[model samples]
Target: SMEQVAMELRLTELTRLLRSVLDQLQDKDPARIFAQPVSLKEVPDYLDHIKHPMDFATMRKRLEAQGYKNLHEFEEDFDLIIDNCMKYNARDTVFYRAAVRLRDQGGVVLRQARREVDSIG
Candidate 1:
């Protein structure tokens, strides 16, 4: 009985420690922090406004196939455009155009998700 009690206590302690470590890891990873997916609902209009219509259907399909899931998911692609911008050393490129639209539209989802999580606890 004493041995069993000791084991149970150890298990509980380990779980607590593991959870703390997980929380810390999530804090360090922006992707983990925004683990939830955000919508690309406004993306079409955003691309249109910027006259990036050629990418509209393609981008929309990409987002849809990707499940229109979370902010983190959307942001991964956005980062690629930023990378392209750096590679070209100019913001006038197609990548930059996509980046601007993504930032504006994705920012909407990010803000909403933030509010949700913040309100939870």
Candidate 2:
């Protein structure tokens, strides 16, 4: 059916866009601070503060598994990555500043893609 075919193509496009966003995130973070998750045993009371942890490593898994199907889903995790940073690191620290940088750039890429890529019918 045309609907099936149309939606199939949309899925492929969605996957590609998600991949690009994920890759851009990693490229922007040279220090790889948000690339992986911190061990609960390593960071004291880490889970206590952040009810849930989010990282590129996990995001990739979700992407790989098709756990996410829309751009808005990325926002939740993207915001989580930065939220965790500012909470753990001081405003003057590199970690905090890096989040700020990624937020601005990432936000632009994300916002641009959402508006420029497609329109719902």
Candidate 3:
């Protein structure tokens, strides 16, 4: 049950982070700033194809199919955030916040995909 509890905690923290950030950025929501539609449905497949971090650009063609032509462009930024996050213990507040950032930025794409996937015919 320890993993279950940890998962629950992460979920709680994620929820709070979204609420807080969205509130703060209500006037300048990045969700509305995406230049193009982004489909997150191909995320799992993209991750599967590129098992290594440096291979983020390998699936650009695949990502393009999902309206995500910028994964290659943001790979470095994502890696830096991940690198910083991993330097601290997971229980640390900064570490958790970093995790939420990672999830939020990454989820921007996946959230839409997941919603579409869940509503499949």
TM-score of each model, in listed order: 0.32, 0.85, 0.26
lDDT of 1 by residue, 5-99 (tens): 97666555444433343233334334331233322483444433332222222334454343333335444544544443344335776545544
The top-ranked prediction according to lDDT is: 2
Q: Which candidate wins on TM-score?
A: 2
Clash list (residue pairs), candidate 2: none
Sorted by lDDT, highest first, which candidate order results?
2, 1, 3
lDDT of each: 0.42, 0.83, 0.40
| Candidate 3 TM-score versus the reference | 0.26
Q: Could you tell me how far off, in angstroms, the CA of residue 15 lies in candidate 1 after the best superposition?
A: 18
Which of 1 and 3 is the better model by lDDT?
1
Using lDDT as the measure, name the better of candidate 1 and candidate 2. Answer: 2
Badly placed stretches (over 4 Å) of model 2 are 1-6, 119-121
Candidate 1 regions with alpha-carbon error over 4 angstroms: 1-89
Candidates 1 and 3 compared: the better one by TM-score is 1
**Per-residue lDDT for 1-121 in model 3, tens only?**
9999976665554444333333333223343321222233734443443333322222232333332223233334345334534543365665455455655666565455445333541
